[PDB]
Amino acid sequence: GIVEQCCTSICSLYQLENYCN
């Protein structure tokens, strides 16, 4: 999930984009 993935480690703009439609 984004939380487990982006709240323990700073997600980059590209990792964030994986959660886009």
Give min distance, CB of 14 to another protein, in A: 9
d(CA 7, CA 2): 8
User: Which residues ranging from 1 to 20 are in contact with another protein (CB under 8 A)?
Assistant: 1-4, 6-10, 13, 16-17, 19-20
d(CA 9, CA 20): 19
Size of the site for another protein (CB under 8 A): 15
Distance CA 15, CA 21 (A): 13
The residues of the shown chain that bind another protein, judged by CB under 8 A, are: 1-4, 6-10, 13, 16-17, 19-21
